[PDB]
Amino acid sequence: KDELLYLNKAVVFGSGAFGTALAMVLSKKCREVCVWHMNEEEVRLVNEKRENVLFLKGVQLASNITFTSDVEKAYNGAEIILFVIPTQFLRGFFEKSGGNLIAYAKEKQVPVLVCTKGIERSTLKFPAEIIGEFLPSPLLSVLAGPSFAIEVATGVFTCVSIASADINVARRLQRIMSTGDRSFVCWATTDTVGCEVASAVKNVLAIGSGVANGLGMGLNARAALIMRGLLEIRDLTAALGGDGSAVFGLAGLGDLQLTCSSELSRNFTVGKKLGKGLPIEEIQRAVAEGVATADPLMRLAKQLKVKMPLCHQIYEIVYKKKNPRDALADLLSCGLQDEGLPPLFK
Amino acid sequence: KDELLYLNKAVVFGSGAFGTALAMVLSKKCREVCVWHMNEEEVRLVNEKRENVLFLKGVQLASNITFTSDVEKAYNGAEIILFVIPTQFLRGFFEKSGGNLIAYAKEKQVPVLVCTKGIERSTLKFPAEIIGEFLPSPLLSVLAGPSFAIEVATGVFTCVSIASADINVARRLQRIMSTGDRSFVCWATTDTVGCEVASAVKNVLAIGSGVANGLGMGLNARAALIMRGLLEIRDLTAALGGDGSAVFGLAGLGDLQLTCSSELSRNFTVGKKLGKGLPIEEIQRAVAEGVATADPLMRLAKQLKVKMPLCHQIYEIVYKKKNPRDALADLLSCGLQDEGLPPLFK
Ligand SMILES: CCCCCCCCCCCCCCCC(=O)O
Ligand SMILES: CCCCCCCCCCCCCCCC(=O)O
Ligand SMILES: Clc1nc(Br)nc2nc[nH]c12
Ligand SMILES: Clc1nc(Br)nc2nc[nH]c12
Ligand SMILES: Clc1nc(Br)nc2nc[nH]c12
Ligand SMILES: Clc1nc(Br)nc2nc[nH]c12
Ligand SMILES: Clc1nc(Br)nc2nc[nH]c12
Ligand SMILES: Clc1nc(Br)nc2nc[nH]c12
16 A cells, blocks of 8 residues: 555654654644653743754744653554654663553554664663563564754655564555655665664764764765775674665665765764864763764674674774774775675576 | 785876876886877877876876877886776777787786776667777776775775676786775775676766755755665666676765765756756756766666666656656655565575
């Protein structure tokens, strides 16, 4: 079925730039959209100003979007649930405030869409995996793709992928998330692991992209970093049991090339400053997602025995004071090799 | 062997920006480098000025690079031959001036490296295929990857792939083209067809990237165009008998993402003007490579029965006056689909 689905209510848990942008997307497909945000005082400000002045400045919220600090009112009556709570707070949220939410989702069979990106430090688990400890996995999908929040929020043409182990679940979500003006287009896939890996690793590679710029390198270098870094996303995906079909799609290469070309982003400027020779302590006086991800990414790579050359060198630069030029020369000391891509056709 | 190879002489046939940049690369690996250019008066100017003032302004040529209008002196003693003659003049060159050159290359077993990109209008053949009508295919390699000429010419870090049916030939060329300071790095592959397809199609997609910008779309759109367009490079590669291992490497995605992000390039500005609604005749008052490639690309796609949605719509906009917004809506009238990538892992 290529016919779109419209709903009475959607709830978005998480009030960041991306969460708000998706609320904008859902406001064209659901009569009512609640965005949950824990601080009551800030919720009131946002509803009065008709604008997420904290994380999406300069964008007018649709009149059918309401911010709320009350979990129970947020999800009550919802026909789709989105999670964009940052990784570190996910488990705590379900433990402290998810009891009724979980019961409701279980009972009503409400589709859940995971948009959180990262790796949990204590378990080295990805967001949809964490959420799957609480909500039955058949209800779980992942959304990932090249999607700057501001472009998504103002309706500028965007393609994403929706991943689900059962393709038919992804296909239902496709009908819900895709807009009537074709401004937001969704492609179905099975590769939830690939999506989640790409989403986490892209942020670490975007620091490297910054390093390259601060070292004096140009766009050829950035293009090579993307291509070689994609192979590390692939190998980690394999080791984690993923089928890998998202790696070379919108969730993998698509989001990765966009994130690494984002010159004004926090990951990039942190990487640029490191490339220019500044120590991380001086840069740290919000944290860049790549900085946070690099340590548990390394720990996970080591546990699975997956070599991630670029990501490892980025970890060394960020966490272990390594000179970026020594890291570059270490990277380039492997000698001449084959590209390392299998043939597609026999 | 990871040890580099150094040579007495290299010859580069073709004096464009890219050809000159590669002469700069070879000047660090060969004692002598000749760059052939047919006009004697312009050859004299370039040698006096120590600068390709016609196609690489502002870059000082290495002292061991000599421009020449004499084919016989150009190749005499060369241990590697590069071709960067534009596609339309390739056959004519061999027919009119290649007789002795071919004999020499055959007799001395001199490696030939194809860097020309495009499709010949009369035969719908790719450059290495044309050259292979004259020089034995075992001597033939293709160079392709993300490589802006100016960045390559001034020694800024660049990775390319070298493709050859016999991987061992690619591996020898790898040792010749890779520089001692690791500023120019080469990766070996077998996928000559994929390289040549990517090289031709990227120029047509870069027009579309322009169209997207002129229509008001943003970076999310560009990222989606790259990803979907890569699938058209893949399908045309399959149909042509290529193994496809370069499609997702430096020659494919790598070069494609760089070319489509090149805002100041001729392909992009032509596409931008078309997106803003200007007719092609008004824009045409040099030709953009994407404009030239689009017609024979379509004819080749039709002959092989390969559907190339984006490329077809770009052809319609360029050649058949089609409104870019009707083309976009036609593209987006296919309904909701799966991403169309096979799993990597079972
Ligand atoms: C962590 C340093 C970041 C600097 C950015 C370098 C620019 C991209 C370099 C890509 C080439 C990587 C070569 C890897 C070789 C290997 O497989 O071990
Ligand atoms: C030729 C028009 C160029 C305008 C650029 C559009 C921006 C990228 C659009 C990518 C989505 C393409 C959808 C193709 C669907 C299909 O497989 O038929
Ligand atoms: Cl404790 C906590 N929980 C959630 Br959900 N989000 C937060 N943001 C800051 N602290 C937070
Ligand atoms: Cl998203 C969108 N934008 C413009 Br401009 N025109 C359209 N027509 C249908 N969907 C459209
Ligand atoms: Cl999504 C979309 N569709 C059409 Br038709 N035209 C556009 N121009 C910008 N975005 C557009
Ligand atoms: Cl006829 C001809 N041959 C070659 Br090689 N290059 C050219 N450039 C313009 N006309 C040309
Ligand atoms: Cl290409 C290159 N550039 C710089 Br800066 N330093 C180097 N050291 C070895 N190769 C190098
Ligand atoms: Cl190629 C290269 N190598 C090293 Br070490 N450092 C650099 N800085 C810029 N390019 C560089």
